[PDB]
Amino acid sequence: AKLVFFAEACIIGCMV
Amino acid sequence: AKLVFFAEACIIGCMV
Amino acid sequence: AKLVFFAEACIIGCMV
Amino acid sequence: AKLVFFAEACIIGCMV
Amino acid sequence: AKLVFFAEACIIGCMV
Amino acid sequence: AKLVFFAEACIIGCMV
Amino acid sequence: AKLVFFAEACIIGCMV
Amino acid sequence: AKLVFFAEACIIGCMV
Amino acid sequence: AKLVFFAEACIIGCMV
Amino acid sequence: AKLVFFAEACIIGCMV
Amino acid sequence: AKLVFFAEACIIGCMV
Amino acid sequence: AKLVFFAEACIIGCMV
């Protein structure tokens, strides 16, 4: 898997 | 734009 | 305190 | 949105 | 001074 | 190239 | 509060 | 769980 | 050992 | 190689 | 000592 | 110059 940083703008990293 | 580290506790970054 | 990086996934730092 | 780490060398992050 | 992250969107930290 | 935070759980950034 | 990377050169993040 | 930075030296963050 | 982020506040990562 | 963080100011990581 | 980021590629920070 | 991560232990990045 990959650690992905999204941000709806606040940012958060999530493991996918 | 800037990246703010709102940590209001936890820390999240967002721009302005 | 400490700065825990909870991985509940998603990583968030929080002061504990 | 995502944060990409274009490192094309140096590293810079940008969203999509 | 402060280390400030701006991003014209690619991000870069700079000491101000 | 792009730099992805790999995962499989430890995380490493690598070049691609 | 906000978390700023202080500087004066070393950098530290602190709560405000 | 939380992210642990092991020191094997070298530093690897792992989800524990 | 582990790298632990103390909130001595200001964030400082130290070994233990 | 190594990952130098040049502070020419502004911080950029580059593979050297 | 110093924390040096090796590009062993993948980025790994190690002590020296 | 470049950012050096001193290990005094604890880790402080300083502009050198």
Numbering used by the authors:
A (entry chain E), B (entry chain F), C (entry chain B), D (entry chain F), E (entry chain E), F (entry chain D), ...: 1 to 16
Provide the authors' original text about this structure:
Oligomers of the β-amyloid peptide (Aβ) contribute to neurodegeneration in Alzheimer’s disease and are promising targets for therapies against Alzheimer’s disease. β-hairpins have emerged as important structural motifs in Aβ oligomers and have also been identified as a component of Aβ fibrils (77–86). β-hairpins are the simplest antiparallel β-sheet, comprising two hydrogen-bonded β-strands connected by a loop. 2AT is composed of β-hairpin peptides that mimic an Aβ17–36 β-hairpin, while KLT is composed of β-hairpin peptides that mimic an Aβ16–36 β-hairpin.
We have now designed and synthesized the covalently stabilized triangular trimer KLT, which mimics a triangular trimer formed by KLM. To stabilize KLM into a triangular trimer and thus create KLT, we mutated A30 and L34 to cysteine to create KLMCC and then oxidized KLMCC in aqueous DMSO to introduce disulfide cross-links. The X-ray crystallographic phases for KLT were determined by first synthesizing a variant of KLT with a para-iodo group on F19 (KLTI) and using SAD phasing to determine the structure of KLTI and then using the structure of KLTI as a search model in molecular replacement. This approach succeeded in determining the phases for KLT because the crystal structure of KLTI has the same space group and unit cell dimensions as the crystal structure of KLT.
